[PDB]
Structure formats: C-alpha cells, structure tokens
A = this chain, B = another copy of it.
Amino acid sequence: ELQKQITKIQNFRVYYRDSRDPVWKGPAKLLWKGEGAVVIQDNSDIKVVPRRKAKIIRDYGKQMAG
C-alpha cells in the first residue's frame, strides 16, 4: 500500500537548474519532495535541488506513456 504512493510520486517530472548554469535541465524523476529541497533522478544520477530551483509538473501529455 506504500509502494503505490512511491510509484505515484515518481510519476511527477522536475525541470531544475544548477547554480551557474542558466539553462533549464530536462525532465527528471521526482524521488522526494521536501520543505526546502527536492530529490530527483536525472540520467541515472540522484541530485538534490533546492526548492527555489525546480518546477515540478505532472505533464498531462501523460496520456500517451509514463
């Protein structure tokens, strides 16, 4: 009953940015969402983004895949 909510929270995509890179990195996989940080998985790399550097969406072109 727990694993379904974890797979549900990994269905959300994150568009994030690094510290001196002005370009938005692509849709990562939301692993964890906190009050001040967001743990993502981008290109098999587990990153910790600040909350102020991430845009988390459930892209509603999920009606093809995901």
Q: Residues of A with Cβ closer than 8 Å to B?
A: 1-3, 5-6, 8-10, 19, 31-35, 37, 39, 41, 46-48, 60-61, 63-65
CB contacts (< 8 Å) of A31 on chain B: these are: 32, 34, 39
Q: Chain B nearest CB: distance from A64 CB in Å?
A: 6
Whether A1 and B60, one on each chain, are in contact in the complex, defined by CB atoms closer than 8 angstroms, is: yes
Residue from the list B3, B5, B8, B60 in contact with A32, Cβ < 8 A: B3
CB pair B9–A34 under 8 Å, yes or no, is no
**Which of A32, A33, A48 has its CB near the most chain B CB atoms (within 10 A)?**
A32
Contact between A32 and B32, CB atoms less than 8 A apart: yes
Partner of A9, one of B3, B46, B65: B3
